[PDB]
Every structure is written in structure tokens, then in C-alpha cells.
Amino acid sequence: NDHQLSVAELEQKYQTSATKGLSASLAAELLLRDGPNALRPPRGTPEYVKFARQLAGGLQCLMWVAAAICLIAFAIQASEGDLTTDDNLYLALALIAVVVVTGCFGYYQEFKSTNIIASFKNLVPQQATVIRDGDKFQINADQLVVGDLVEMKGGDRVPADIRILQAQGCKVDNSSLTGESEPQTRSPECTHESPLETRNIAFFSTMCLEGTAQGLVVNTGDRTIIGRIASLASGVENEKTPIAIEIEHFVDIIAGLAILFGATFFIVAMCIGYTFLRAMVFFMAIVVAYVPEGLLATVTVCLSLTAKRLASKNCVVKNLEAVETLGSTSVICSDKTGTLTQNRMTVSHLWFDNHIHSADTTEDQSGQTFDQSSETWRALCRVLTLCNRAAFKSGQDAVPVPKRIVIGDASETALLKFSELTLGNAMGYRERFPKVCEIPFNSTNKFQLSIHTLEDPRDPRHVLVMKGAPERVLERCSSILIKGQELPLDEQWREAFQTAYLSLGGLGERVLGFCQLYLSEKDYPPGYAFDVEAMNFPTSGLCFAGLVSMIDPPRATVPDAVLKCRTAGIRVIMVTGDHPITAKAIAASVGIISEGSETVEDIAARLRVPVDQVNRKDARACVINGMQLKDMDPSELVEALRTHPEMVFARTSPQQKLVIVESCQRLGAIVAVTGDGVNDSPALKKADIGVAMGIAGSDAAKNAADMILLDDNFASIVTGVEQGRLIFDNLKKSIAYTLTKNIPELTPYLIYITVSVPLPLGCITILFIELCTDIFPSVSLAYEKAESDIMHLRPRNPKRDRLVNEPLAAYSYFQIGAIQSFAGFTDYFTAMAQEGWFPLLCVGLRPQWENHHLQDLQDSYGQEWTFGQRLYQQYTCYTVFFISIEMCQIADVLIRKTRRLSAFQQGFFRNRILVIAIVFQVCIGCFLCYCPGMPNIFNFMPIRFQWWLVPMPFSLLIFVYDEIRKLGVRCCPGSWWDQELYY
């Protein structure tokens, strides 16, 4: 491309000049033809559109349809002249109100999360240095056009995609755009055919770390690499969450059951003499009755509680559905640079006294140190402290050393921080040795030298410290320091040095050589005028001190987090734009590649055979670079993923990261992506859940992600997985509890229509049960502990393990709900008989009972009743049925605490929220029963005490039966009882 062209081929394509750049008029014409040099802003969506989205969903749509059916039934009944149709309006209004309030709550959650995340993004206008027709001036970066000649220096953002024309020690930070952790040299020479690896292209929005550069703008705005990544992420479609899919499946179950029951009882009603329209109204009533009213609120509150628990650990979700996805995640695709690692070059390994020492690389210094007693170590520390020119920024004493800011390149910064963390007071030690000569680094020499004066006033000797590339240091240095002895290199130290250097380089680490040479007093006395111009001082015959190597190390919690994720059965895959050697080293360090795992290259090296001879199934680990990934089809990619459990993708473009995520999803897995840079944003959007670092994350990554780790603690992923699994189980329990009470709410209406008994349960009391008395107990089940080691289980099968399944639905509806219905009808008949209405007289009584023209209807004793007196008796029936349901729901909430364990094992009172909810439910029931005015306000009656007692044996039966069922499950695993009766 433009890098592969020449300056002769350029200077004509862009109508520009290499020395003077563009004319001002032509630059203005180009700025008119193409937009300003700025990425297009996301149009986004309006707040009312987001609210309308919150009003959507599977359960929301079911509730909207139920309300519409209520309104249609009301219209039909009004057309037929029927009255007392306020029940339809009450049901529709309750459904609409629950949907709208839940949507408001969810929108408020998203608004708070957006504010919290955007509280860390800040904007500052940028500027560039442009040369136009000869004149050099500081112009706004947005006014840059293709062909504009620009100059950048250290500390300056790269203002566009630029082909380098001149450069003197120019280094850039490509860790966000690419995956490269080390600073990258920019030179005016082509070193590759792809624009993402050649050294003569600087990238828009990257930082020039050091040096100066000159070049021509070749891309602008959305035409840049970062703009193209933004366009690529824009085309990625966000799929539905696993919890949304589960909710839709469960809504389908409810719809099917509602249709079946409605059709059956429509046929029954037609057979028993009802008119077609009356039977149709019965059908619609049953279909509406099957739709739960408060379940949406319960689910929203449970998800909000889990989100609050995560947010207490600095883990912020953008939507409530994201609190579950980590629990179901089976594959994590992890970015390396800045996500698994700290994105900071740190001292890792030292080679002195013929031993490879390991340094503490954790940002909090919570790891193991190395031996610091040898005089060789003392000399090495002196050399690496005196041969540093980096300095900490002033007023930074209290800031932790790894996070401090120093003025200098990455190598000198890492060495200065190492000195401050091991020697202590690095600059205070430096000032004790005044510098009397200094040769800065240069590529012709590839070393840095400085001559100091010893701190001790007794010693007039001058110390000459030297650091540089290990081969350049060892071409000099005819002596080595081992345990305080200055032995020469009798080829044994040469071979050992070569072995250590090769091992350290193969660990993906950049190695530096350090040496020293004390200058004798008789030939170099105090006041000697050392001259860099003439090289009077000796530059050879030095004493080699040691080798220091550097890497971008993992974050402190990352290795244990990866180990716990792999223990939870989650496959961890590294997807990075960095180089394969560094990628493999970091993957081994963090536990992605386990100890003993080998690649085909490793096996070939071990067996001294060609790589293609090795059997691919003998290699547990695998490293695939982007070049091979390009020449791979989906079949080969799937085969590699299935063949090698421990996979590392290195040198991977954002498009290839997206491809890997799509392949894993196509295989059937729920995939989580963790990243921080712009190169992760398309994969973050494609992922089932995207997790971005709060501090290290870019704006694109944080906008693409669903979950933000505010403190960049990777161990929060483990908490997310655990909380997702816990909320899945607790939502299962809560939904079972909510669904159980629907059957005793509907059976009285079915009996009222078929057997023509006076109505046992009213719409208002049903609404009170649904929305007032049971929501708190249902929500309290979200505080249940796990009944097993939840983090040692495998990820659930998305196709097999549904949130709501046939055993759960059947149990809740037709065993516990059936018992509750029987309790309610027992109380109903008891209260009728004790007030003068025997059950057989109750059968078929409804038309006379509801006849407003009958004011002397006779009961079983011959007593004559008015319509008002019978209506108050009907309200009493409402109240006894309500209290029966409440008493049985107490036992239901007690038995729904566990699915396998006993109540005695789990603890009756260890969920104080659940205990408080039970007390609150009983208190509200008592208030509704015995507050004055209730009979005429909400048709609740002050029932007698013995009608509280009647359903209690049924509640005890519920508890005992569920305990026996769970005992049978625990005692006979794998039996028919476990297969059928467990849920």
C-alpha cells in the first residue's frame, strides 16, 4: 500500500511535497471534499427509545397480550349486556402497571450504570504539528487532510494514519490498537507488506513515546485503522442473552398450557349448555388467568439484587440480564495485553551468580522476592541504579511505586521502579554518586555509559557503569563477577551467558546486560577531565555484573482467577495481537497453558523430529498466529479448537478475534470476552457477555462491553461466574414458588363456571395475592446459599438445562398447587356450612345466589337471605380462600429454599430476609382481614380463627411431602424417583 510505495510514487498521489507538504488552498479544498479528521460520533438511541425497549421482552409481550385479551373480553361482555366487568379492567390495569413500573426500574438501572461508567471518560481537544507550503504551525488535528505533512515528538498523540518519512529514535505505543506490549520503533523504511506490521506507518490515536518523526497523512477520520475498527464493531449485531432465551422458553410453556386448558374448558362449557360467546369469554379468562402478574417484578428485583452484589465488588453491569451470563459461560476468550497483563514493562528475571533469579512483578508487591545478600547483587544494583536517567514526577511520594509516573522510556522506568522497590530511594542513591561523564544511548554503539564518583570520601576511585544489549556488553567485559570474584570468561562463562540469554529471550523477555569498571586513582585521579570526544577513559576490559530481563507481567489476581475459571469447567482461550513468544510465555504464566502441556513444536523439539511428523492429538497446547489463521477455513478452525484444549491465538486482528468468537458460539458455547483495547470491541460486542477493564479500557471497549470492572480486578470474573450460577438456581426456586399459587387462584373459577357454586375467590383478592403478599417472599429466595460446591460444577448445558422445565412446571402446578386448591376448597366449604350453606346446596346455587331479584333465598336451615347478606358471605369465602393460599404459601416458601437438601440441613432461619418476609406476609394478611372498612373497600372479611387453622394441616402436608421427596432424591440418585420427581 502507501508504505510499500516510494516517496517518488507518493508526493504525486496526494498532490503534496515531502519537504513543504500541502498548499493551504488545496488543503482547504481537501477538507471540503473529505470530512474533518475525526471519527464519526455514534448516533445512539433516544432515551424514550431505550424506555420503549425496556417495555419489551418475552414476559412483557405475554402480559401485553393478556391485557389486550382482557379488554376484548370486556368489550364482548359489555356488548352482551353483561355487568360486573370491572374485573377485566382491574386485571388489564394491573398487568400494564407491572410492565411499566418494571420497565421504569430497568431503565433507571441502565441510566445509573451509564452515568457510573461515563463518570471516568473525559474529553480534551487535540492538536497537531503541520507543515504547509513550508511554514510550520500547530493546527487542530481535525483540520488535517490526506497528504498533509506532519511532525510528531515524544508525548504527542499521532494525529492521523501517517507514513513515516523521517524518524530519529521514534517509538510508539500500539498496545490499544494492536496487542503489542513493547514500544514499537518507527522508521522511514518498509519492513512488511501489511500496514499493521510495517515500521513506517504510525496509527491515529496512538502515542509517540519518544523521539521525533516526519510523515505524510495517508488516512483520515473513519478511513484510519481505528475508524475501520469502529465501523466493524458497528456492523456486529448484539444477540439475545441466555436469561432472555430462558424467559422466552418459559413464556412458551405458559402459553401452551394456557391454550390447552382454555380449549379443554371451552369444550366443557359448550357441552354443559353455555352459549358460544360465553364459552369464548371463559376461554379468554382462563388464558389470562395462566399469565402471572408479579413474576416480572420478582425477576427484575432478583436480577437487581445480584447486580447490587456485583457492584459492591466494583463490577458494574449495563443491563440486568448480564448478571447471569457468566454463570452459563463455558468459554472465555481473553485479550492478553492490558487485560491479563498490567500493560507495563516490569523487571522479571535476573541472571547473576550463574543463577536465574525471579523478581516480584505484581503491582501490589504481594509475591515472592529473590535473594538480595550477594555482593554481586549489590554491585548489580549499584550499576542498574547509577546507569538510569529516568526520574519520578515530583509530589508522588505516597503513590505506590508500580503505579507512579516517571519521565523516561519504558526500560528506564522499569529499572527505576525496580531500584525504588529493592534498593529504596533510587534518586537519593544516585545523588550520592556525582556523575562526571556520560555517553547517552546510540544505535551505533548500542550501549549507555556513565562515570561517577564513589560516595565514600575515603575512596577517590571513579566507577564506570555500563548497560546495553547483552551481546554488545559481552564483546567487551573480559571479566565476570561471581560471588564477589572477578574471574575472566574462560569460555565457560561465555557458554553459560549464551544459554541464559537464549532462555530469557525464549521466555518472551527483553534482556539487558550490566557491568562495571572501577578506575584506579593513579591513572584517573580526582578532577580528571574525561572526554567523550576523545574516549580517553577505558571502554573495554570491564567486569560483567548480571543480566536483567523485562516483560509486561500478569496482574496479581489473574493466575488464580484463571485457575478458578478452569476449575469451574470453563475453557480459557488467549486471543491477542501480540507476538507468539510473549503470548505463549504469558499463557504459561497465568495458567492458560498448564504445566506439562506441550505444543507440536515442543514435541518436535523434544524428539528431534520435524514438526509435521508429530501427531496433533499428543499436543495439549497450541499456538496459532494470525498468518496461519488467515489461511484456515471454518472446518480447520473447528478441528484445531476441538483438538487442542489449551489454545493461544497470537498476532490476531480484531476481525480474527470476532471470527474466533463466532466459531466458538457456532459450536454451541456461551462465550465471554474480556478486553480493554479498541482491537477487542467487535469481539466484545459479538460475545454473549463482554467484560471490559474500567481503568485500562478504551472508550470503544467500554461501550461494546456489557460489564465493566471498575478497578481492573480480573478476579471479579470468578465472582461473576459464581453469582450467575447462584442467581440461576435462586431464580429457579423463586419461579417455582410464584407459579405454585396460580393453580389455587384458577381452580375456584373453573369450579364456579362448571359446578355453579357461589364464587369462592375474587379478582381483587387474587390481585392482592399476586402483587402484595407473595412478592417479598418470592424475592427473599434470592438470598439462598448454594446447596453444593457450585464453583466445582461444570457449566450448564444450554439446550438441556433450562431455567423452567417440565418437572418444575408439573410439580409446582399439579402437586403443590393441587394441594393448595384442596385446602382452599376445604376452607370454603367449612365457612359455607358453618354459616348455613351445605356443600350439596352450594352445588348449582350460583344463579339464585347472584340473582338481584331474590331477597329471600333459603339456606340449608330454611333461613332466608338477602342479596347483600349473601354477598357478604361471598366476601367471607374470598377471605378464607385467600388465607388458605397464604398459609400454604408459607410452607411453599419453606420448601422452595432447597431443591435437593433438607430444610434441616440448609437451616430454617439462616435466611433472615426470608423470615422477615414470612412475618411481613402474615402481618399484611391480618391487616387486610381485620382493618375496619375492608369489607366494603377490598371485600376482605374478619374471618373467625378456626378458618385460619383449617389449611394448616395442608401446609404441613406440603412441607412433609416435599421433605420426603427430597430425601428420596438424596438417598436414591439415578433412580426413577430422581429422574421424575426431582427438579
Binding site: 376445604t826 356450612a833 354459616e835 331477597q855 336451615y861 330454611g862 333461613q863 347483600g868 358471605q873 373467625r944
Partner: protein
Amino acid sequence: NPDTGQMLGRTLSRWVWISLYYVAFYVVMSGIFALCIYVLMRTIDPYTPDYQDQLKSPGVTLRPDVYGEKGLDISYNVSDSTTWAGLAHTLHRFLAGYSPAAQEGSINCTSEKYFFQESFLAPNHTKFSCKFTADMLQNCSGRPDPTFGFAEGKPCFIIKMNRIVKFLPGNSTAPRVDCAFLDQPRDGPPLQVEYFPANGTYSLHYFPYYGKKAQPHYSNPLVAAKLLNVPRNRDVVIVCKILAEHVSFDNPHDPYEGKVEFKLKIQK
């Protein structure tokens, strides 16, 4: 999913097993429910209800009962016999159950005092019930006027109190029916009524009512209110209240408790 070998994700033998389990579950629960109902019915007293929580005061009904859109509404034309033929027929049908033949199962009563019966001395382990005959209504019995005063524009209305087991209206004096205009006509005088029996009282020996098992032949005592100064071609509202010490008629949620209110128009 409805595969032949595996019908809705479960084999045929497994379906038999789970179906038998559900059948056993529902049979057991149905048996428990039936046993509960049996225990309840064995604890229920056959003569006296356990509670009368909704029957503190008796309701009051009217004959003939014609209902409009908000309550009782009676309208007829004096010149048109077909307008009150149905009303007179309703009154005749109601009084059919008060003939001496219909009242053979009851006895003469003359005490004017509560008929307190603590033993079962009537035929077939029952209690005596007092006898009320249509001829006690005199000019409103259908004899010698089979129109009940409707032809002459002086209609008879039968007021009946709802019977409650062991309810006592008050023994200081007999409960009495009082009928008046709900809102007094401006130019006209108050309602003039003539009552059968005299003063519109129910004798105290019709109380207490002991239920239908103890008194299967019981008949509610009747009071006939004959209206005498109803204006013609005018809409009037008439309320007939029961005046007794233990009867209340101030229930805002039951307009039939202790009283009966009907709309009446007599066209000409």
C-alpha cells in the same frame, strides 16, 4: 418431539409410570378432601346453624315483586285490567301456600307470646309451627275481591320478614309494619294505609323460627298493607319498615335489611 418410539420426550412405559403416579397422588388427595368434608358434616348441627354472622337483622320482601332497573317498580293502569292481571295472579299464587289445606300441618295459636319449644313434641320428632291463613288478610286475601284492590286503585302489598333461626324481634310489643312516602309529596297528604292484621303486626307466637328440620310446616306471618291515597299518574316512592326492638333498617349496603322500598305509579 412426538416421535413414535419416544412420545413427547418420554417412552411409552415411562408415560404409564408417571401417569400412575399422578393418578395415585390425585386419588389420595381426593380421599383426604372427602374425609375433611365428612368430618365437617358430622360436626355440623342439623337444627341450628353454627353462626349467623350475616343474619343480624332480617330482610324484608314484598309481594307482588316486580323489578325495574334499580329495584322494585310497580306500574299499572286502573282502566286497563291487563296491566294488573299479572300482579293479581302473582298475589294469588303466593297466597295459594296459605290456604287451610296448605296450613293443615300447623296448629291454632293464641298466646301472643314467644312460642318457645325446647322439646320435639310434634309428629315425627318435630316442633309445632303456628298456622297463618290467607283469611287473616281480610280485605287483601283475594276474597271477596280477587283483584287485591288493584282494580279500584287501592292496591294491597304483602310484607314478609325473612325468617332467621332463633331470632327474637322483641317481646315488649309485636313487630309492626309501617309504610310511608319516602319523600312526602308537596301538595298532597301523607300516605294513608290500612293494615291486615290490624295495626300491621306479626304475632309473637310465630317466633322463634327453629329451622326447616324442626318446623317443616313453618309459614312466615304476613302483613297486608292496603294503600288508600296514592295519587294518580304520579311517580311515588314508598318505604315499608319493620318497627321492632331488635330489627334495624339503617344498613347503607343492604336496602332490604329491616325495610322494603318500592317505586309505584298508578296510571288512569
